[PDB]
Amino acid sequence: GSLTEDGLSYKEKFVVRSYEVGSNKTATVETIANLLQEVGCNHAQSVGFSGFATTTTMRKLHLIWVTARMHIEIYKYPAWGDVVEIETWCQSEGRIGTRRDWILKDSVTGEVTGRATSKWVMMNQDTRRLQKVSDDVRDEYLVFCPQEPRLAFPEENNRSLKKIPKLEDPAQYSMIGLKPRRADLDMNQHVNNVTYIGWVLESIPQEIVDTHELQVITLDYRRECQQDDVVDSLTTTTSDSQFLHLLRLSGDGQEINRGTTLWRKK
């Protein structure tokens, strides 16, 4: 991997692994999500940051970057043995936080096979309180981002910025009692954000998975699943096939995630 000529974006190639593919022998959306996360960490390393991509000033204030929303759109999933190239860049969206974008390409043809966007906020790692981005912290990141707007999703009022509603009981489909295992944790012992995508998809029936391909997934992150927590995954068809998703703690029903998926007939 490497920063591009201007040093304002990062590129990396990946060869799709045998354990990374589904029944179609093409990379799963969780593998795609893990590769986006990997190129994001490598971009942070290449410029001196750090998976919290922190400055020494944020480390002193116990401040970290946390994902608020992830949106992924796949046109063609890379097959087993194929090389996929991913370009990524960050951009501030005012005091709200930062946006990280990705573009996925086929290394052979050069065609865009997918794109992603994510919204991040600044949080005190202990109090879990959002303190919003200050000027002296903002200025430390501005030299690693382009000044002109560079958007993976430029269309006005696109799918990535749509408001997601709360699923109402009874759900059409459900997957109950989901628990994370040690392989679901990251290096800081927190549940990896990709696990939540997997948990959302657990409530999609096998008939949909076998006859359709996932085109779009949008996920909101509200609360973390704290290791010894149990998750319920709820899904209702809202339609192509569209679904509304809800992740909640098995006990009291506290919301952890809300999302939507769009699927195309094979």
Ligand X SMILES: CS(=O)(=O)Cc1nc2ccccc2[nH]1
Residues with catalytic function: 188, 190, 225
By CB under 8 A, tell whether 194 contacts a copy of itself. Answer: yes
By CB under 6 A, tell whether 44 contacts ligand X. Answer: yes
Residues 57-86 that bind a copy of itself (CB under 8 A): 80-81
Which CB, 47 or 216, lies closer to ligand X? 47
Q: How many CB atoms lie within 10 A of CB 50?
A: 13
Q: Which of a copy of itself, ligand X, none sits in contact with 47, Cβ below 5 to 8 A by type?
A: ligand X
Indicate the residue type of 212.
Answer: H
For residue 133, what is the DSSP state? Answer: -
Q: Which residues precede a break in the chain, with C-to-N distance above 2.5 Å?
A: 50, 239
Residues 205-224 that bind ligand X (CB under 6 A): none
Which CB, 22 or 55, lies closer to a copy of itself? 22
Which of 26, 28, 37, 98 is close enough to bind ligand X by CB under 6 A?
Answer: 98
Q: Which of ligand X, a copy of itself, none sits in contact with 49, Cβ below 5 to 8 A by type?
A: ligand X
Instruction: Report in angstroms the alpha-carbon separations of 152 from 83, 156, 171, 197.
Output: 21, 12, 33, 20
Distance, in Å, from the CA atom of 38 to the CA atom of 255, rounded to the nearest integer, reads: 27
Which CB, 143 or 183, lies closer to ligand X? 143
By CB under 6 A, tell whether 71 contacts ligand X. Answer: no
By CB under 8 A, tell whether 41 contacts a copy of itself. Answer: yes
By CB under 8 A, tell whether 19 contacts a copy of itself. Answer: yes
By CB under 8 A, tell whether 179 contacts a copy of itself. Answer: yes
Residues 145-184 that bind ligand X (CB under 6 A): 145
Q: Which residue has the tokens 């909640």?
A: 248
* Residue-level length of the chain: 266
Tokens of 215: 């085109």
CB of 141 to ligand X, least distance (A): 5
By CB under 8 A, tell whether 54 contacts a copy of itself. Answer: no
Number of helices and strands in the chain (H, E): 5, 11
CB of 145 to ligand X, least distance (A): 6
Interaction mask 205-224, a copy of itself, x per CB under 8 A: ----x---------------
Distance, in Å, from the CA atom of 54 to the CA atom of 141, rounded to the nearest integer, reads: 10
Q: Which of ligand X, a copy of itself, none sits in contact with 141, Cβ below 5 to 8 A by type?
A: ligand X
Tokens of 38: 């990997």
- DSSP letters for 195-252: HHHHHHHTTS-HHHHHHEEEEEEEEEE-S---SS--EEEEEEE---EEEEEEEEETTT
Distance, in Å, from the CA atom of 61 to the CA atom of 230, rounded to the nearest integer, reads: 32
Which of 29, 37, 39, 43 is close enough to bind ligand X by CB under 6 A?
Answer: 43
For residue 107, what is the DSSP state? Answer: T
- Treating both helix axes as pointing N-terminal to C-terminal, what angle do 193-201 and 29-46 enclose, rounded to 10 degrees? 170
Which residues form the interface with ligand X (CB under 6 A)?
43-44, 47, 49, 53, 65, 90, 98, 100, 120, 141, 144-145
